Enzyme design. Sequence first.
Site, mmCIF file in Angstrom:
data_model
loop_
_atom_site.group_PDB
_atom_site.id
_atom_site.type_symbol
_atom_site.label_atom_id
_atom_site.label_comp_id
_atom_site.label_asym_id
_atom_site.label_seq_id
_atom_site.Cartn_x
_atom_site.Cartn_y
_atom_site.Cartn_z
ATOM 1 C CG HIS A 80 -2.031 -1.064 1.060
ATOM 2 N ND1 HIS A 80 -1.944 -2.261 1.732
ATOM 3 C CD2 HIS A 80 -3.179 -1.115 0.345
ATOM 4 C CE1 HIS A 80 -3.003 -3.004 1.445
ATOM 5 N NE2 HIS A 80 -3.759 -2.336 0.594
ATOM 6 C CG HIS A 118 -6.850 4.574 -3.082
ATOM 7 N ND1 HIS A 118 -5.875 4.517 -4.055
ATOM 8 C CD2 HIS A 118 -6.876 3.354 -2.501
ATOM 9 C CE1 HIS A 118 -5.361 3.303 -4.075
ATOM 10 N NE2 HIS A 118 -5.951 2.585 -3.138
ATOM 11 C CG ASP A 119 -4.508 2.345 -0.135
ATOM 12 O OD1 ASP A 119 -5.362 2.338 0.779
ATOM 13 O OD2 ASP A 119 -4.359 1.449 -1.053
ATOM 14 C CG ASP A 229 -8.025 -0.466 -3.982
ATOM 15 O OD1 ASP A 229 -8.679 -0.680 -2.929
ATOM 16 O OD2 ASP A 229 -6.794 -0.163 -3.979
HETATM 17 NI NI NI Z 1 -5.622 0.581 -2.424
HETATM 18 NI NI NI Z 2 -7.088 0.914 0.942
#
Ligand code: NI
Ligand code: NI
Length: 330
Positions: A80, A118-119, A229
């Site tokens: 991530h 988003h992460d 994702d």
């Molecule tokens: Ni992600």
């Molecule tokens: Ni995530």
Amino acid sequence: AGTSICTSEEWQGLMQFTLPVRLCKEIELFHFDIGPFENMWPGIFVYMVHRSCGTSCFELEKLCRFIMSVKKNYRRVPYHNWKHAVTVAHCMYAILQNNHTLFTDLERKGLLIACLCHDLDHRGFSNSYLQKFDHPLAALYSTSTMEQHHFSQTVSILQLEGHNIFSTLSSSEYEQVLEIIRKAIIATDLALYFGNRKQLEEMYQTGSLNLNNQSHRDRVIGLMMTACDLCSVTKLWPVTKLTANDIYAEFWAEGDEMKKLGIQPIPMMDRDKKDEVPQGQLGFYNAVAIPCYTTLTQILPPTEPLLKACRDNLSQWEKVIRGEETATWI
Ligand code: NI
Ligand code: NI
Ligand SMILES: Cc1ccnc(N)c1[N+](=O)[O-]
């Protein structure tokens, strides 16, 4: 502690970056793998924003500051991380390019930014872990714990001096884009995906699905976020397999921590249970990835190559299970 900020050298460097001409053609394709081009990642993001949204959508200095500060607030975790961010953003670009006029200028800019962010500040730990061991984040954010954090991190970065790429929007459009970004990031909570996909499948099959209906739009956008994702599963097999190594590296590190706190981890996070990985991947593809890309292809027909690639990768995991795997490098 605190939000990290890029250097002058970093953002001025990105401003002057030019994308090699041969990659212009490749970047449009769903299966494009950013892997071999690490030095170019931030530039690839600029390029995508410029092609989807226009070279004047954001002030260039603020965009480059924003991007390089985003990179600095991804941690050096196995999966991530910054590479994941840009990969997810590229899938979104490819979906947007193939479906361009379905989405407003505001949605396209919001979503490419949402994907990059988003992460943000992911620590290598799952929502499951944070809530089991009552991390402060789980107290602050009762559900979608890390995703609420990633959104908060996004807003912190926009609030840095000279980083607010959205300031030139009207007060109404500014509110609208932050909401687009919030909903999109929250939607990357896989907990929410199951309900979302099921609802969308129903709206689609009964033909009530209507993209002029805001709540429908939000759900379609949510599934786009899931598809982006998870897009490691839509690459060529060797790329998918290498990325799966990184995913599991992270999982096994969390599992190790759980063992120290007296709890046996799920097999997926157990480094002493690697024999179960191929079946675990089969489960994940059958339960999550295949249905996602299936429904996404129904709603957005041009996304079909994501589904075809996902199916090819499922076949490869099946081959592994049957003992038909060939030489792999890691
Ligand atoms: Ni992600
Ligand atoms: Ni995530
Ligand atoms: C989230 C997840 C879990 C297990 N296997 C995967 N491939 C995966 N993924 O794709 O992110």
